[PDB]
A paper describes a structure:
RNA ligases of the RTCB-type play an essential role in tRNA splicing, the unfolded protein response and RNA repair. RTCB is the catalytic subunit of the pentameric human tRNA ligase complex. RNA ligation by the tRNA ligase complex requires GTP-dependent activation of RTCB. This active site guanylylation reaction relies on the activation factor Archease.
To address the issue of nucleotide exchange, we determined the structure of nucleotide-free RTCB with a single Mn2+ ion to a resolution of 2.6 Å. In contrast to our complex structures, the nucleotide-free RTCB structure contains only one Mn2+ ion in position A, coordinated by residues C122, H259, H353 and one water molecule in tetrahedral geometry. The lack of electron density in position B indicates a vacated metal binding site in the absence of a guanine nucleotide. The conserved residue H227, which coordinates a metal ion in position B, is not involved in metal binding and rotates away from this position compared to all previously solved structures. Concomitantly, the α-phosphate-binding residue N226 is moved out of the nucleotide binding pocket. The displacement of both conserved residues, which is not present in previously solved RTCB structures, is due to a rearranged loop region from Q218 to Y228. The conformation of both loops in our nucleotide-free structure changes the accessibility to the guanine nucleotide binding pocket. Hence, the structure of nucleotide-free RTCB provides an additional open conformation of RTCB-type ligases with regard to the active site. The concerted movement of both loops suggests a latching motion towards the GTP molecule during the initial nucleotide binding step prior to guanylylation. Strikingly, the conformation of the aforementioned loops in the open state would sterically clash with binding of Archease. It should be noted that the engineered His tag and protease cleavage site were still present during crystallization of this RTCB construct.
Author numbering: -9 to 153, 159 to 433, 446 to 466, 475 to 505
The structure:
């Protein structure tokens, strides 16, 4: 986020001229008027509380004022660059946890009309870790039941990570990329109820393994070497607060102190490679279709392009692979819990509460200016949050709205949110994904009471401020707060 811009204008400005393009819509939302960056097709908006508002406008002035080396790209500027993409509708939107990233800002959503021939798809609008996501499992155990054996549970979970639960040959992987969680179901590593409580039923149709490069496929095949890359993250959690008892009851969360397990994983290097190969092929074809962007990292292809069609089919394939990896972690988590407590996984009520993505592009029906349209919704660092009574969400959540899982870092709380009708109207059903940015840790976590198994010692916008901002804006609703007692990052 520095010299990736083409030689362009609008850069002979100071903080006061940039403030001219900025107006506050309401208590929790700001407007970016056109002209903030070149070639804006729609306006931009971001959601703030008084704290996150300070950091956003400080990051603007620190880069805008200049007077030093850097030229760092503010999140407010990347929002506008995304608003300059052909095909975008409504507005490019920054969720409360918006921070700067490759082309798109992390936490910056934008949707494109699939009936517009100039509409494009941007891999930078999905992210390199395609379909990194969160999965929440409930248990019938209480904190008093788990707190004594938390070290053994964490060790058993850590020891279960390395070992056929994951596609171990290229042929199995080609099926996993095509079938998503349907591969795990056939191979015994997933329950049927896991699919019904999973975004897109754990499988994105029309995925094509032929659109995934051979290097990408080998990046996704298991390696006994190079373990410790950090792609596996798990957290044994305790229900610390229930803001909505009925939403919690429909998720099986019966009381405070109940134990849950949170799983965080993605496509590892397969998605990184799928995103990279697309970016290269798109750079070479943007001229043929005459696409103009402000940021070279906004490299995109038209949806109708062969390169745009290839990416989405490959992107869907990596998303399927990510669900297979989280199902295998579920299978190993279920096995870890089964052995420590010496029973069967079902007798511990180890069902999937929900599973969301936050690095994916989805084809969704949305109403734009009173007209139903088919939109390609880019969500990098943002979570889908469908409202109550959406016909395509689980029957169990037809009255609560779609559960939204918020990732919590080491020692940080996690949240379960619900979708809202207001979020479908304002943000196309989009909400935050977690926190943003801009041995000592070991003893702090131990003193907090958190057992920790981490492979290598190599391994801000507060999540609380972010979820409270979304709750106040009405684009999400707080339901559960979870506290970690064991963190497993291998
Ligand atoms: Mn993630």
């Amino acid at each position: 986020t520095t010299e990736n811009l083409y030689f362009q204008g609008a850069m002979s400005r100071s903080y006061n001229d940039e403030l001219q393009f900025l107006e506050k819509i309401n208590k929790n939302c700001w407007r970016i008027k056109k002209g903030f960056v070149p070639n804006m097709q729609v306006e931009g908006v971001f959601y703030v509380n008084d704290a996150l508002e300070k950091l956003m406008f400080e990051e603007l002035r620190n880069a805008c004022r200049g007077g030093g080396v850097g030229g760092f790209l503010p999140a407010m500027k990347q929002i506008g660059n995304v608003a300059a993409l052909p095909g975008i509708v409504h507005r490019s939107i920054g969720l409360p946890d918006v921070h700067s990233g490759y082309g798109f800002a992390i936490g910056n959503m934008a949707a494109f009309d699939m009936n517009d021939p100039e509409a494009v798809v941007s891999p930078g609008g999905v992210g390199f870790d395609i379909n990194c996501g969160v999965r929440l499992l409930r248990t019938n155990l209480d904190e008093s039941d788990v707190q004594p054996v938390k070290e053994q549970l964490a060790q058993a979970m850590f020891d279960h990570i390395p070992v056929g639960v994951i596609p171990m040959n290229a042929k199995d992987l080609e099926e996993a990329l095509e079938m998503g969680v349907d591969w795990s179901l056939r191979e015994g590593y997933a329950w049927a109820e896991d699919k019904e409580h999973c975004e897109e039923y754990g499988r994105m149709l029309q995925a094509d393994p032929n659109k995934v490069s051979a290097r990408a496929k080998k990046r996704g095949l298991p390696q006994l070497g190079t373990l410790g890359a950090g792609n596996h993250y798990a957290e044994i959690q305790v229900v610390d607060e229930i803001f909505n008892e009925y939403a919690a009851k429909k998720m099986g969360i019966d009381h405070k102190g109940q134990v849950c397990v949170m799983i965080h994983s993605g496509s590892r290097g397969l998605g990184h490679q799928v995103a990279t190969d697309a970016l290269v092929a798109m750079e070479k074809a943007m001229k043929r279709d005459k696409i103009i962007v402000n940021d070279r990292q906004l490299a995109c292809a038209r949806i109708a392009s062969p390169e745009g069609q290839d990416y989405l089919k490959g992107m869907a394939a990596a998303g399927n692979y990510a669900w297979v990896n989280r199902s295998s972690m579920t299978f190993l988590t279920r096995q870890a819990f089964a052995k420590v407590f010496n029973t069967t996984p079902d007798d511990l009520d180890l069902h999937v509460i929900y599973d969301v993505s936050h690095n994916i592009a989805k084809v969704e029906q949305h109403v734009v200016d009173g007209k139903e349209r088919t939109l390609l919704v880019h969500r990098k660092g943002s979570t889908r949050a469908f409202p109550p009574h959406h016909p395509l969400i689980a029957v169990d959540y037809q009255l609560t709205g779609q559960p939204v899982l918020i990732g919590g870092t080491m020692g940080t709380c996690s949240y379960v949110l619900t979708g809202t009708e207001q979020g479908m109207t304002e943000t196309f059903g989009t909400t935050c994904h977690g926190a943003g940015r801009a041995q000592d840790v070991l003893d702090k976590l131990a003193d907090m009471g958190i057992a920790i198994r981490v492979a290598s010692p190599k391994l801000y916008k507060n999540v609380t401020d972010v979820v409270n901002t979304c709750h106040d804006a009405g684009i999400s609703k707080k339901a559960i707060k979870l506290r970690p007692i064991a963190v497993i990052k291998g």
